[PDB]
Motif scaffolding. Structure first.
Motif, mmCIF file in Angstrom:
data_model
loop_
_atom_site.group_PDB
_atom_site.id
_atom_site.type_symbol
_atom_site.label_atom_id
_atom_site.label_comp_id
_atom_site.label_asym_id
_atom_site.label_seq_id
_atom_site.Cartn_x
_atom_site.Cartn_y
_atom_site.Cartn_z
ATOM 1 N N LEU A 192 -56.847 12.196 -17.706
ATOM 2 C CA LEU A 192 -55.643 12.714 -17.365
ATOM 3 C C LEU A 192 -55.469 14.173 -17.923
ATOM 4 O O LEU A 192 -55.805 14.249 -19.075
ATOM 5 N N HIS A 193 -55.419 14.977 -16.865
ATOM 6 C CA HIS A 193 -55.047 16.304 -17.481
ATOM 7 C C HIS A 193 -54.190 17.044 -16.240
ATOM 8 O O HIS A 193 -53.875 16.427 -15.498
ATOM 9 N N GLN A 194 -53.702 18.342 -16.264
ATOM 10 C CA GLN A 194 -53.174 19.336 -15.630
ATOM 11 C C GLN A 194 -53.992 20.312 -15.210
ATOM 12 O O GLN A 194 -54.409 20.961 -16.536
ATOM 13 N N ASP A 195 -54.211 20.756 -14.080
ATOM 14 C CA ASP A 195 -54.943 22.021 -13.699
ATOM 15 C C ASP A 195 -54.154 23.160 -14.240
ATOM 16 O O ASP A 195 -53.017 23.467 -14.034
ATOM 17 N N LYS A 196 -54.959 23.791 -15.268
ATOM 18 C CA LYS A 196 -53.795 24.608 -16.312
ATOM 19 C C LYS A 196 -54.565 26.006 -16.219
ATOM 20 O O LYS A 196 -53.986 26.910 -16.459
ATOM 21 N N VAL A 222 -53.413 17.831 -1.506
ATOM 22 C CA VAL A 222 -53.027 19.272 -1.882
ATOM 23 C C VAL A 222 -51.724 19.036 -2.632
ATOM 24 O O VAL A 222 -50.738 18.445 -2.366
ATOM 25 N N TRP A 223 -51.727 19.739 -3.936
ATOM 26 C CA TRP A 223 -50.555 19.823 -4.550
ATOM 27 C C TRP A 223 -50.311 21.139 -5.405
ATOM 28 O O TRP A 223 -51.088 21.918 -5.507
ATOM 29 N N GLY A 224 -48.890 21.583 -5.265
ATOM 30 C CA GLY A 224 -48.560 23.201 -5.392
ATOM 31 C C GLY A 224 -47.157 23.233 -5.513
ATOM 32 O O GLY A 224 -46.638 22.031 -5.860
ATOM 33 N N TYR A 244 -49.592 16.454 -14.240
ATOM 34 C CA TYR A 244 -50.763 15.424 -14.637
ATOM 35 C C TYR A 244 -51.492 14.795 -13.625
ATOM 36 O O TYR A 244 -50.715 14.161 -12.682
ATOM 37 N N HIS A 245 -52.697 14.533 -13.623
ATOM 38 C CA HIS A 245 -53.373 13.903 -12.678
ATOM 39 C C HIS A 245 -54.803 13.454 -13.241
ATOM 40 O O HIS A 245 -55.147 13.828 -14.106
ATOM 41 N N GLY A 246 -55.530 12.495 -12.623
ATOM 42 C CA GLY A 246 -56.683 12.100 -13.112
ATOM 43 C C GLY A 246 -57.534 11.008 -12.209
ATOM 44 O O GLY A 246 -57.113 10.855 -11.266
ATOM 45 N N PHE A 296 -60.611 22.846 -4.567
ATOM 46 C CA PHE A 296 -60.476 24.272 -4.243
ATOM 47 C C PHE A 296 -59.393 25.025 -4.885
ATOM 48 O O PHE A 296 -58.426 24.207 -5.147
ATOM 49 N N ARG A 297 -59.686 26.117 -5.545
ATOM 50 C CA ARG A 297 -58.725 26.818 -6.444
ATOM 51 C C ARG A 297 -58.808 28.346 -6.313
ATOM 52 O O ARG A 297 -59.897 28.953 -5.897
ATOM 53 N N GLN A 298 -57.742 29.003 -6.504
ATOM 54 C CA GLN A 298 -57.619 30.538 -6.567
ATOM 55 C C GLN A 298 -57.826 30.670 -8.095
ATOM 56 O O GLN A 298 -56.869 30.099 -8.984
HETATM 57 CO CO LIG Z 1 -57.640 18.626 -11.841
#
Ligand SMILES: [Co+2]
Ligand SMILES: O=C(O)CCC(=O)C(=O)O
Length: 203
Positions: A119-123, A166-168, A175-177, A198-200
């Motif tokens: 579990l993490h957050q795209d940070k 897709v999340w924003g 948090y997701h994992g 996919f990310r900017q």
């Molecule tokens: Co992530």
């Protein structure tokens, strides 16, 4: 189909049709920048093999994470993002309500039976304005999705072959994992699961 939740939707079986072309273009990228294990600064080694495509590539090490144009394993640029990766991505992003998304990074994940993403957050992205587009390919996985804080009740969802998340917006630092991938067979991936995020990272 399209469900939840809060600045985030699931596009169910969205990448279904393009999965064969994605797998092919995953392989093409891999022939240049190969998959490899990565050691987290905490000393733990990740059961998720990974490689990158696009302008920037994410790797973790002992000192920590990094976004790079250069592949530390090859000492050459990460493969250009394949036509089909690009197309699929914004087609998902539009449908998700992010019409002005354009990624520069794509972290490709490969999961074996028993593999797990903690579990993490795209940070590690400066521009919180852009969404995250996650593609699920192969064996089914249980993808947990909570919220801003670590203690938010997580919700458990089955992500299956072709499924897209897709999340924003308000749900961006959520948090997701991934839970230990159960063994099985899938026609396209044989006995594993592929996952594109996919990310900017620049802009
Ligand atoms: Co992530
Ligand atoms: O495998 C997944 O669906 C999660 C991918 C993810 O969150 C990541 O690569 O940071």
């Amino acid at each position: 189909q399209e469900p939840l939740a809060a600045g985030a939707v699931i596009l169910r079986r969205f990448a279904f049709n393009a999965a064969e072309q994605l797998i092919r273009d995953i392989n093409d990228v891999a022939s240049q920048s190969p998959f490899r294990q990565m050691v987290t600064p905490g000393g733990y080694t990740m059961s998720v093999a990974m490689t990158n495509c696009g302008h920037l590539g994410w790797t973790t090490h002992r000192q920590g994470y990094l976004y790079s144009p250069i592949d530390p394993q090859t000492n050459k640029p990460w493969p250009a993002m394949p036509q089909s990766f690009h197309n699929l991505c914004q087609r998902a992003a539009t449908a998700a309500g992010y019409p002005d998304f354009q990624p520069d990074a794509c972290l490709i994940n490969r999961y074996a039976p028993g593999a797990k993403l903690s579990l993490h957050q795209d940070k590690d992205e400066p521009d919180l304005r852009a969404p995250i587009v996650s593609v699920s390919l192969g064996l089914p996985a249980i993808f947990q999705f909570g919220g801003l804080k670590r203690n938010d009740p997580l919700k458990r969802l089955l992500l299956e072959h072709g499924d897209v998340v897709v999340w924003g917006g308000e749900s961006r630092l959520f948090y997701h994992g991934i839970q230990p991938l159960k063994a099985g067979f899938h026609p396209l991936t044989i006995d594993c699961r592929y996952n594109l995020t996919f990310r900017q990272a620049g802009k």
